[PDB]
Amino acid sequence: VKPNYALKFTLAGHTKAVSSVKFSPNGEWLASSSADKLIKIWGAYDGKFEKTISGHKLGISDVAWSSDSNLLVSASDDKTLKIWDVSSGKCLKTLKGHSNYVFCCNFNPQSNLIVSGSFDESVRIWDVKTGKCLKTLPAHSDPVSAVHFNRDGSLIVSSSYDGLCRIWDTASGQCLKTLIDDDNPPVSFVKFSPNGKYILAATLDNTLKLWDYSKGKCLKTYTGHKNEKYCIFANFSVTGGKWIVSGSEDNLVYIWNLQTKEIVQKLQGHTDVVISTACHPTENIIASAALENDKTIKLWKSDC
Numbered sequence: 001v002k003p004n005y006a007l008k009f010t011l012a013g014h015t016k017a018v019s020s021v022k023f024s025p026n027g028e029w030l031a032s033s034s035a036d037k038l039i040k041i042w043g044a045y046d047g048k049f050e051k052t053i054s055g056h057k058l059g060i061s062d063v064a065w066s067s068d069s070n071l072l073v074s075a076s077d078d079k080t081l082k083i084w085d086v087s088s089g090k091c092l093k094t095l096k097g098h099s100n101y102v103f104c105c106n107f108n109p110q111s112n113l114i115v116s117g118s119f120d121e122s123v124r125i126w127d128v129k130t131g132k133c134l135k136t137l138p139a140h141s142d143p144v145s146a147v148h149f150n151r152d153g154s155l156i157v158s159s160s161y162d163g164l165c166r167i168w169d170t171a172s173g174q175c176l177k178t179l180i181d182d183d184n185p186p187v188s189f190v191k192f193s194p195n196g197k198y199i200l201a202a203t204l205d206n207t208l209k210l211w212d213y214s215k216g217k218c219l220k221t222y223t224g225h226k227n228e229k230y231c232i233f234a235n236f237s238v239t240g241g242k243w244i245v246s247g248s249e250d251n252l253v254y255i256w257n258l259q260t261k262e263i264v265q266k267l268q269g270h271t272d273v274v275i276s277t278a279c280h281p282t283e284n285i286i287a288s289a290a291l292e293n294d295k296t297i298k299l300w301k302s303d304c
């Protein structure tokens with residue numbers, strides 16, 4: 001009925017705000033990105049520092065893993081994405097085309113494509129092998145905060161400060177759906193559920209919503225956290241009980257019961273805004289990352 005996440009490790013090494021944490025799909029690693037221009041890799045289960053990957057000329061907003069856990073893509077204020085071979089540390093490609101800061105990135109499940117979102121208000125779809133931009137979608141009328149492929153990679157969901165969530169046909173680039181409820185505050189985060197049936201979206205009015213995107217309807221609302229300024233990443237936790245996990249501008253990690261919308265746990269320990277959370281793919285493990293006054297990542301574990 002409630003999880004019991006408790007602090008296991010604190011991962012220190014970044015010298016500026018940590019922007020994003022992601023578990024590799026094989027569960028072995030955690031990748032982090034930071035305003036210090038670095039990506040760091042850490043052991044998912046022991047928190048042990050593994051390696052630093054360098055190359056971007058300015059801060060990094062996001063990182064994401066290929067399905068086989070061998071590659072990473074990073075999104076940077078230097079207006080590029082980079083594709084990295086994690087084992088070698090090599091920069092395989094630099095993806096150039098956005099006209100301003102790149103805020104978000106994801107591989108498709110096949111991992112032959114990358115999707116990015118930018119301050120330039122576009123969503124771009126890239127070929128992984130060539131590094132070429134395949135499509136530029138004039139997706140929004142304000143900065144794009146998140147981009148995510150669905151389960152089979154046929155759809156992309158995007159969120160923007162224009163107050164909309166939009167769903168795109170990956171093959172054609174056509175907009176298939178615009179989601180909007182009874183108001184349009186900036187949408188700061190969106191992703192598909194693991195089964196691809198729902199979309200979780202955050203807005204800068206301290207709210208998370210669960211949407212049925214086939215039906216175009218909001219099913220659940222989660223509140224009690226603080227989120228009016230930063231684009232804070234949230235997740236579905238599915239390995240034990242079914243939770244919603246998010247960071248918060250009061251420095252806590254919030255966990256909600258997905259069905260009942262009740263807050264079930266608030267994880268204390270960070271000293272600044274928790275801007276990113278991630279949920280381990282097979283174990284009940286959460287990673288959280290915090291901003292400039294904290295500079296650390298924390299790994300929490302629960303029995304359920």
Ligand SMILES: CN1CCN(c2ccc(-c3cnc4ccccc4c3)cc2NC(=O)c2c[nH]c(=O)cc2C(F)(F)F)CC1
Nearest residue numbers: 017018019020034035059060061062103104143145161231
């Ligand atoms: C995993 N998340 C991290 C936050 N993302 C993001 C999203 C949006 C913006 C942003 C930034 N500026 C904006 C100005 C006007 C209107 C909208 C704006 C939106 C800016 C960001 N990125 C940052 O806040 C950021 C950028 N560059 C960094 O070096 C470090 C960070 C961060 F604060 F650590 F996360 C998305 C991915």
Ligand SMILES: [Cl-]
Nearest residue numbers: 050051052053
């Ligand atoms: Cl190193």
